[PDB]
Design a protein around this ligand. Structure first.
Ligand SMILES: [Mg+2]
Ligand SMILES: [Zn+2]
Ligand SMILES: [Zn+2]
Ligand SMILES: [Zn+2]
Lengths: 551, 178, 107, 171, 112, 87, 97, 270
């Protein structure tokens, strides 16, 4: 979806490279230069200001605009803007690793707290693997706390050789809320760890040191854990549910970005102006807050920044969050088209795999059958028959990515067809469907059935496939899905068939016996006592479809 | 729908670097001597001088006017219009480029015999210069190196004044008349 | 092969793995009172040559990584003086095939 | 100068043409897509080579639409010009700020001030020309040109150049 | 002997109830529990930690955090797996998609 | 690397057709036949590409090669000509 | 109607890979994007009419690729970019394995 | 949780069972390469019973006036009495029955004979029985060279893995072992004629039907093992509506979590 041709060569994704956004990679992705916390209104004139949402990125309203690309909404993805912070500030969920990295390196000088001049260390250096290498190194040198200049070489403990200069003691580090703290060692000396500082420190660490310490020269270098500018999320990331006109409807997310921007301007206009220097920092701890809040707002540091009404605001981590969240709910299954739920009842007469489907649905649901010699007659027939005669159709689709409302268009009872077109038609009898009854506990709750189109408003099925899905008749509701690709109905009809799962590879046995009425009487009848007579017997014989035709 | 070639290096993200070109022989990373063949076998550079080209096109377009009928089953001046005919059937009808170049070549070639041509080739491919240097030398005329290596900068120190001198002397001999 | 009765000096072992090539294995009496391998619930594991190993690797197309693994201080592993890069051919019963032929590298 | 390289091509195909001349249509379609073409990479793809031994290879059938992709292995004659390079060609058009020359499927362009510090512009002629002591460049004249720069563009390589150096200019 | 006791017990869980599971099942479960080295638990601390497609991993509890640690440690997903593909709506390399299909230049001619 | 090709001799894997393979091939075919594809059988009276390709298999006339992949990074080419159908 | 996790697993069991792909693309999400071949970032300026492409700064008008992928994941990626992690998707592999 | 551990585990194309990474789990699914559907519960008649009845029912000795078969059974039966060339086989075969019983008695200490086994052979010879309408009052025609030399062959044709390499071959054998044992059990020579009542045809038909019905039951490389088996311990579990030790549901959880601090930890000293 996102129609109309594309000169673009199609491919598929083989690898996903997870790296970290460098301030310049952003400061280059970026079209627009976000400076204004006002969405739009050109001093109140409905539109947008060259500041936030579409200074030159995605667009609201059904109007083509968007830096040249036009195209318009459905088709357009976001185009990113950037936000230059005042002074560098911390990432939220990278802060644990920031601490655990500060603990392994000498600040002020920038290097490892251990070389190949120490076997317990050099032996962690053999540990090929980021996660446990970094781990062995952090466990290893979080104890060591002075910037050694000289170590006992692998000869003897007498002559210590020299490796790196400065020695300035390492302050043992503790975290507090959204700040870092050090204490250089009678009595310690507690000093706060300032961003810009820590930054510069990371930023003077050599490349090999990078590497061995779980960091990647091109896709993820330490500096980027401390943000300079900002990834400014294009419009439909944060979509405004406007109410016609003269209102708005913006997103909590957009309001948090306007909030951030605000805070940033506030700070900035103290570093140009008359700085109560140690009141400037009193506002930097706002930037540091919000930028951490728009990523995450459920930390340990209680303050769960609400937004004017009690609403906690939904930090981004909350959209990806488990169940219902993007992944456990949108990308691992979703709501979908060509589907149908209804009350199920049982009929003792349709072949195991048949499935009684009401008119209202053999009427509602479309199969897109293509336009081809063996069917033309049929297809046209339906078409003229129109979306109301039971065996009708609903849309014709032209080789020009163009639909036809088979209940609207003037040319209703007209249109000849076209070799290479598409009839979206009603649902015929013996058709492949993917019936199923959640909860999904095995193959046997999720099978394919041949359709039998019928009256009344109830799904109908075979008593003895009651145990596979496991549905009583106290009023159970069931799901139905419809094929779409020919080969879809293939996979369905050669794999998912209800008589394919008569023998279960779970207990190496049948999972679809006879039941209740049936069995109960199959016994009442089997008996020695049970002698039938001509009249009835005959009715019996005929009752059986294959009966060779012999008494 | 794009078109591919035989040597993709890693998308190291590091976009920058790839230099510009000159008669320091410096070509794109698509035209240096060592380039891998189609069956995977390393192979030198295929830089063909004028004429050598016209012959290539004529021929491979004759095997084309041949194959284009094997399934049908079920002199300067003159070459001009003869080939303005060959193309007239073999192309698709849009190669303004390809026809143009046919004229250019057919008029500016120095040789027109699969014989004299070869001759030249086995003459030049003796001083193992860049298959380019070769080519240029094999489609542009001269008298002294003073012109030669001036118009073909890539030489200069590579092949001596008097030996490139001989090679010129020989080339104005093998110069197929018109 | 050295057997200790109740314990060895925490600095006496401090000079075990510092005599290449040959190696050095501590052991406890009470750790050898009964046979590990003779318990009903174990099978036979088997040492392999570099050739047997590289053959298993080529005929299954496996990389070292892709192979199942066994600890080093696995009781069984000490039993056979297992080393880093070595490989056992576990071999056991089966209520489905009678015999199943397993493999493990050493951690 | 002219080159010859091995290349390939991702060509996709509808399940209609799964008939028995499929091969030739693939050939054809390739020739459509490629012949006379131009990129920044290689350059003016002139004509394919060796129409007989065109490398097919089986084709993989795409996951949903019936179509099938073929990676046509082929090889062709092509043409990419360069900086500092010398080539001579026939003139094609003339202005006041200079004159244009055609070489191969491509056009080199020369500006006035890329000509002799004594070469003159005669627009009082027909067709327009450039005058000098002995030289008289015009509509058709053949000239030796030093290509000074290439500029990739859509489906055309264009360029600029000079005749100011020695041993350069008309012939 | 581990894998063993392991099964036995997992088994008395099922046979205690009186049910029938066919060896191969829990047998597998258990081989997965053991192979990698010792006892790997069916839990977030457990198997999730390993090396699967980062993406696959983050369809299990520890989302955001995974993705963070993953993007820091320069991870690179093979995508050779269900969840991975699935997220990218590509055909999951399973059975009905464990193999490519081709037209055959040659044999196509024989059939006319 | 194209050296990832297991030559048609020294071949390895089941000569029979997997239910999976089959469903996917029958599919592919019916899908391209409803794509105005060329048939290679006589429609003894058939319209539905499912029935069609079914009766294109029973006459193993289907220009198709299953390129099977083997973990590490290999492939074996098996044409429907080649395979069998116990299934 | 919803078709998720548990269902996805059942259909994995039947092993019908394609049916999945469709049920969860052409029967729901679905969507087309363009990506650089240098940075898996959906940075392409899609000139789907005037036939130009580009993601300047990455200075590319040439090596670019169309790709089908559920819109939901289009979003997820933009979102993980919001949190400053580049999920650079690629057309081909290098690790081989 | 369960499922999310084995999603990507399947039978890759060499019948190895592996994960998305490549790491192997089972080397050959169900340690046999077989598929739960085509599998029914057959009885191993070689493992139970008294050595008395074993000797009786399986022993074939030509060089004996009471132990050779009564020519009523086999046609060429009196022109056999004391044949040194055949007794060479009969004894080798019967040596394999010996070896078997004591191998099966090794694996199944329980003594249990009734088991999950591919290819129903109990019936395949009933279908045969009433399919050729053979009579329990007339003579066979198979040679005792035929019988055991045919069986000897059928065995081989029960492939499961294919490579041309010793590792592979052997491993294969491993796998087929048990089934084999059942084969040798019910295609035994005393059986064929004394119990069943075969004929050249009948026997050759049974030979073939066994073979194919074998290759059918093999696991299809593709099948989604992981998700399979998983769904199938989740399925019986959800039905556990809950001997004084932690039983079921809770214990189960304990287990999956890597039960460290456990509830009822009995310990059985034999
Ligand atoms: Mg109920
Ligand atoms: Zn746009
Ligand atoms: Zn220092
Ligand atoms: Zn880019």
């Amino acid at each position: 979806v996102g129609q109309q041709y594309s000169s673009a060569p199609l491919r598929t994704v083989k690898e996903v490279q997870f790296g970290l956004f460098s301030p310049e990679e952003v400061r280059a992705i970026s079209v627009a230069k976000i400076r204004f916390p006002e969405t739009m209104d050109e001093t109140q004139t409905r539109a947008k200001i060259g500041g936030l949402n579409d200074p030159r990125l995605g667009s609201i309203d059904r109007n083509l605009k968007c830096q040249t690309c036009q195209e318009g909404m459905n088709e357009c993805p976001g185009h990113f803007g950037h936000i230059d912070l005042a002074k560098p500030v911390f990432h939220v969920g990278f802060i644990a690793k920031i601490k655990k990295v500060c603990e392994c390196v000498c600040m002020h000088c920038g290097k490892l707290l251990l070389d190949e001049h120490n076997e317990l260390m050099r032996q962690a250096l053999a540990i090929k693997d980021s996660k446990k290498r970094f781990a062995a190194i952090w466990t290893l040198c979080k104890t060591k706390m002075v910037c050694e200049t000289d170590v006992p070489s692998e000869d003897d403990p007498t002559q210590l050789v020299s490796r790196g200069g400065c020695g300035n003691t390492q302050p043992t580090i503790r975290k507090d809320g959204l700040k870092l703290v050090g204490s250089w060692k009678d009595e310690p000396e507690l000093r706060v760890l300032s961003t810009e500082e820590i930054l510069n420190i990371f930023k003077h660490i050599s490349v090999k040191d990078f590497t061995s310490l779980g960091f990647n020269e091109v896709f993820s270098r330490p500096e980027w854990m401390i943000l300079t500018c900002l990834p400014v999320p294009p419009p439909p990331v944060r979509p405004s549910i406007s109410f016609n006109e003269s209102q708005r409807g913006e997103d909590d997310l957009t309001f948090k970005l306007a909030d951030i921007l605000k805070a940033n301007i506030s700070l900035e206009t103290l570093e140009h102006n008359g700085a109560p220097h140690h009141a400037i920092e009193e506002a930097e701890s706002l930037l540091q807050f919000h930028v951490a809040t728009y990523m995450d707002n459920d930390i340990a540091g209680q303050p769960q920044a609400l937004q004017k009404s009690g609403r906690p605001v939904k930090s981004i981590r909350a959209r990806l969050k488990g169940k219902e969240g993007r992944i456990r709910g949108n990308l691992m299954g979703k709501r979908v088209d060509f589907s149908a739920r209804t009350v199920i009842s049982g009929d003792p007469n349709l072949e195991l795999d048949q499935v009684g489907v009401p008119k209202s649905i053999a009427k509602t649901l479309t199969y897109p059958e293509v336009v081809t010699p063996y069917n033309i007659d049929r297809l046209t027939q339906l078409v003229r028959n129109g979306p109301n005669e039971h065996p009708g159709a609903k849309y014709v689709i032209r080789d020009s990515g163009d639909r036809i409302d088979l209940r609207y268009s003037k040319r209703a009872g007209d249109i000849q067809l076209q070799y290479g077109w598409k009839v979206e038609r009603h649902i015929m009898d013996n058709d492949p469907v993917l019936f199923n009854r959640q909860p999904s506990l095995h193959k046997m709750s999720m099978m394919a059935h041949r359709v039998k189109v019928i009256p009344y408003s109830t799904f109908r099925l075979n008593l003895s496939v009651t145990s596979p899905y496991n549905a009583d008749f106290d009023g159970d509701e069931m799901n139905l899905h419809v094929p779409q690709s020919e080969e879809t109905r293939a996979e369905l009809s050669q794999l998912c068939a209800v008589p394919l799962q008569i023998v279960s590879p779970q207990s190496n046995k049948p999972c679809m016996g006879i039941v209740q009425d049936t069995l109960c009487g199959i016994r009442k009848l089997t008996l020695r006592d049970t002698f039938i007579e001509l009249d009835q017997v005959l009715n019996m014989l005929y009752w059986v479809p294959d009966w060779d035709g012999v008494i | 729908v794009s078109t591919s070639t035989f040597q993709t290096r890693r998308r190291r993200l590091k976009k920058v670097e790839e230099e510009e070109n000159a008669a320091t022989l410096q070509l794109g990373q698509e035209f240096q001597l060592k380039q891998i063949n189609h069956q995977g076998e390393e192979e030198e550079l295929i830089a063909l001088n004028l004429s050598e080209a016209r012959l290539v096109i004529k021929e491979a377009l004759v095997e084309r006017r041949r194959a284009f009928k094997r399934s049908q089953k079920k002199t300067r001046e003159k070459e001009l219009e003869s080939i303005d005919v060959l193309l007239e059937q073999t192309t698709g009808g849009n190669n303004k480029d390809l026809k143009n170049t046919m004229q250019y070549l057919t008029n500016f070639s120095r040789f027109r015999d699969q014989e004299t041509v070869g001759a030249v080739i086995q003459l030049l491919k003796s001083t193992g210069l860049h298959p380019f240097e070769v080519a240029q030398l094999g489609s542009l005329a001269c008298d002294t190196a003073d012109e030669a290596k001036t118009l073909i900068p890539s030489l200069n120190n590579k092949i001596s004044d008097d030996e490139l001198e001989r090679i010129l002397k020989e080339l104005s001999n093998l110069e197929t008349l018109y | 092969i050295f057997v200790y009765q109740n314990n060895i000096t925490p600095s006496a072992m401090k000079l075990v793995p510092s005599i290449p090539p040959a190696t050095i294995e501590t052991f406890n009496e009470a750790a050898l009172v009964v046979n590990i391998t003779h318990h009903e619930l174990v099978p036979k594991h088997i040492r392999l040559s570099s050739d047997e190993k590289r053959e298993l690797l080529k005929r299954y197309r496996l990389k070292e990584s892709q192979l199942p693994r066994i600890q080093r201080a696995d009781p069984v592993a000490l039993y056979l003086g297992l080393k880093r890069g070595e490989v056992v051919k576990i071999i056991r019963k089966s209520e489905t095939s009678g015999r199943y032929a397993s493999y493990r590298i050493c951690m | 100068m002219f080159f010859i390289k091995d290349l390939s091509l991702n060509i996709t195909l509808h399940p209609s043409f799964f008939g028995p001349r499929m091969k030739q249509y693939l050939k054809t379609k390739l020739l459509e897509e490629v012949e006379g073409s131009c990129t920044g990479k290689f350059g003016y793809i002139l004509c394919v080579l060796d129409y007989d031994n065109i490398d097919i290879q089986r084709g993989r059938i795409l996951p949903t639409d019936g179509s099938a992709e073929f990676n046509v292995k082929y090889r062709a004659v092509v043409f990419k010009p360069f900086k500092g390079e010398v080539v001579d060609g026939t003139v094609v058009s003339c202005s006041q700020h200079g004159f244009e020359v055609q070489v191969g499927p491509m056009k080199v362009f020369v500006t006035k001030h890329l000509m002799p510090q004594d070469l003159t512009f005669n627009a009082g002629s027909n067709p327009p020309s450039y005058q000098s002591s002995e030289d008289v460049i015009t509509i058709k004249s053949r000239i030796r040109v030093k290509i000074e720069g290439c500029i990739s563009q859509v489906s055309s390589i264009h360029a600029i150049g000079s005749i100011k150096e020695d041993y350069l200019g008309a012939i | 002997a581990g894998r063993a006791a392991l099964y036995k017990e997992v088994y008395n869980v099922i046979a205690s109830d009186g049910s029938y599971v066919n060896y191969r099942h829990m047998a597998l479960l258990v081989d997965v529990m053991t192979t990698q080295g010792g006892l790997t638990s069916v839990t977030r601390h457990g198997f999730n930690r390993s090396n699967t497609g980062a993406l696959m991993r983050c369809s299990f509890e520890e989302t955001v955090e995974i993705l963070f640690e993953a993007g820091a440690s320069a991870e690179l997903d093979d995508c050779r797996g269900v969840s991975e593909n699935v997220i990218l709506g590509q055909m999951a390399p399973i059975g009905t998609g464990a193999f490519d299909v081709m037209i055959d230049e040659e044999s196509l001619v024989k059939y006319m | 690397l194209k050296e990832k090709a297991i030559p048609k001799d020294q071949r390895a894997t089941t000569p029979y057709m997997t239910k999976y393979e089959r469903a996917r091939i029958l599919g592919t075919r019916a899908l391209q036949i409803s794509m105005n594809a060329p048939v290679f059988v006589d429609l003894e009276g058939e319209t539905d590409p499912l029935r069609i390709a079914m009766k294109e298999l029973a006459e193993k006339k289907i220009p198709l090669v299953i390129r099977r992949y083997l973990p590490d990074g290999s492939f074996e080419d098996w044409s429907v000509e080649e395979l069998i159908v116990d299934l | 109607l919803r078709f998720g996790e548990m269902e996805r697993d059942c259909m994995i069991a039947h092993g019908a890979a394609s049916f999945l792909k469709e049920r969860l693309m052409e029967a729901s999400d679905a969507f087309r994007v363009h990506i650089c071949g240098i940075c898996g970032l959906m940075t392409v300026i899609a000139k789907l009419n005037h036939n130009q492409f580009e993601c300047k700064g990455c200075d590319n008008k040439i090596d670019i690729y169309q790709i089908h992928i559920p819109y939901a994941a289009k979003l997820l990626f933009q979102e993980l970019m919001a949190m400053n992690i580049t999920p650079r998707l690629y057309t081909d592999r290098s690790r081989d394995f | 949780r369960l499922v999310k551990a084995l999603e990507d585990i399947m039978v890759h194309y060499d019948n190895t069972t592996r994960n998305s990474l490549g790491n192997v789990i089972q080397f050959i699914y169900g340690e046999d390469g077989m598929d739960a559907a085509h599998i029914e519960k057959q009885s191993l008649d070689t493992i139970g019973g008294s050595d008395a009845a074993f000797e009786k029912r399986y022993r074939v000795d030509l060089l004996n006036t009471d132990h050779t078969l009564d020519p009523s059974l086999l046609e060429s039966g009196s022109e056999i009495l004391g044949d040194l060339k055949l007794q060479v086989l009969l004894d080798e075969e019967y040596k394999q029955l010996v070896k078997d019983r004591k191998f099966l008695r090794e694996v199944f200490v329980d003594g249990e004979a009734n088991w999950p086994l591919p290819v129903n052979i109990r019936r395949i010879i009933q279908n045969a029985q009433q399919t050729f309408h053979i009579d329990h009052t007339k003579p066979s025609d198979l040679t005792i060279k035929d019988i055991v030399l045919g069986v000897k062959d059928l065995q081989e044709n029960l492939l499961v893995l294919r490579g041309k390499n010793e590792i592979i071959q052997n491993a294969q054998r491993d796998a087929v072992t048990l089934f084999c044992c059942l084969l040798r059990s019910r295609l035994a020579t005393r059986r064929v004629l004394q119990e069943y009542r075969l004929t050249k045809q009948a026997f050759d038909w049974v030979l073939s039907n066994i073979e194919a019905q074998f290759l059918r039951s093999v696991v299809h490389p593709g099948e989604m093992v992981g998700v399979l088996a998983a769904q199938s311990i989740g399925e019986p579990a959800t039905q556990m509506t809950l001997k004084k030790v932690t039983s079921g549901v809770p214990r189960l959880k304990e287990i999956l979590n890597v039960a460290k601090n456990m509830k009822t930890p009995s310990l059985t000293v034999y």
